[PDB]
Design a protein around this ligand. Structure first.
Ligand code: NI
Length: 341
């Protein structure tokens, strides 16, 4: 059955709750973003109202084939009424179309559900600043002090200078970026922009990008692999074997590969700055691991919550074991004692 952390008290609303069949009482199913963990169970066969951003609705329509009658897209930063209750969607700074949701309950309680998010100080001057938030449903993916990472901008600058150098040294090199879902598009679009190229990719991946309301998209991407010097491949192919195999496929148009694996955190975040990073190399193929995160670091999460001062926190990630829950509760009390709420 649907867990309490996916229900919104005193409404018949749920959030990211599609894998449990019909939820008893639920009149509106919200979807924060188009990642398979959150949408799991949604298909062309679902027949209840789904509320979501415009981007998320394009994806539901075109990738999952959910029927149009059941998709209710809502604009951002706008007060809307859903089944008699006032809501607002805000940018989550996660992947394309990902939202936080603000619910104003009839009794006067205010609830923020973050979805998946990367907390940022620009969220301190949104509609959130205008009133007290009593309850916070929080993306606790990286809720432990070991989880540090560079800014997105530091990582992109590094990727740009690295790719530009390699291709100026060898104008027959190919750049490859690994991918598995939506998100982290800036990695490949920034590399392509410094090399004066479009990004080549499969038909399924191009169809996905074409749903994302990215300005000038038709000038940036193509299905003609031949004509482009940045290619996208599935993350699973980003290894020496997969990359040599792909290089054979391209018809001796390239004689070298430089590949990027955007990942979350891995244990080498604890010593290495972005400027110290060096690739793994085997022959004419080099692979760079780059920690481009679309989740809050510990410090980013802590700052956001210390600013917001919620009366209660409801974790939404890593809630499956008592040890994880206990650990997280300890950090929430620390934050509250430091900040005086
Ligand atoms: Ni996500």
């Amino acid at each position: 059955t649907c867990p309490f952390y996916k229900k919104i008290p005193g409404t018949g609303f749920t959030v990211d709750a599609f894998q449990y069949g019909v939820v008893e009482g639920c009149t509106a199913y919200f979807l924060t973003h188009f990642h398979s963990d959150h949408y799991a169970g949604l298909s062309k066969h679902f027949t209840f109202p789904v509320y979501c951003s415009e981007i998320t609705g394009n994806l539901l329509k075109n990738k999952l084939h959910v029927q149009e009658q059941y998709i209710h897209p809502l604009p951002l930063d706008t007060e809307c009424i859903v089944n008699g209750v006032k809501v607002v969607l805000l940018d989550a700074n996660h992947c394309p179309g990902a939202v936080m949701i603000l619910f104003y309950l009839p009794n006067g309680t205010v609830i923020l559900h973050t979805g998946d998010f990367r907390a940022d100080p620009s969220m301190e001057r949104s509609l959130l600043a205008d009133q007290k938030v009593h309850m916070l449903y929080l993306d606790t993916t990286y809720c432990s002090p070991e989880y540090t990472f560079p800014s997105q901008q530091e990582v992109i600058r590094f990727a740009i200078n690295t790719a530009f150098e390699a291709v100026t040294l060898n104008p027959h090199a190919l750049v490859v970026c690994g991918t598995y879902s939506i998100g982290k598009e800036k990695v490949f679009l920034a590399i392509a922009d410094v090399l004066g190229s479009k990004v080549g990719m499969s038909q399924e991946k191009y169809k996905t990008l074409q749903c994302l309301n990215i300005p000038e998209i038709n000038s940036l991407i193509t299905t003609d692999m031949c004509s482009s010097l940045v290619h996208l491949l599935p993350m699973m192919q980003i290894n020496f074997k997969g990359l040599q195999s792909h290089l054979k496929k391209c018809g001796g148009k390239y004689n070298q590969i430089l590949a990027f694996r955007p990942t979350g955190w891995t244990h080498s975040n604890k010593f290495t700055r972005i400027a110290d990073v060096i690739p793994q190399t085997k022959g004419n193929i080099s692979i760079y691991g780059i920690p481009y995160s679309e989740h809050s670091s510990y410090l980013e999460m802590k700052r956001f919550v210390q600013w917001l001062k919620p009366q209660k926190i409801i974790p939404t990630v890593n809630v499956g074991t008592w040890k994880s829950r206990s650990t997280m509760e300890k950090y929430f009390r620390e934050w509250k004692l430091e900040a005086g709420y």
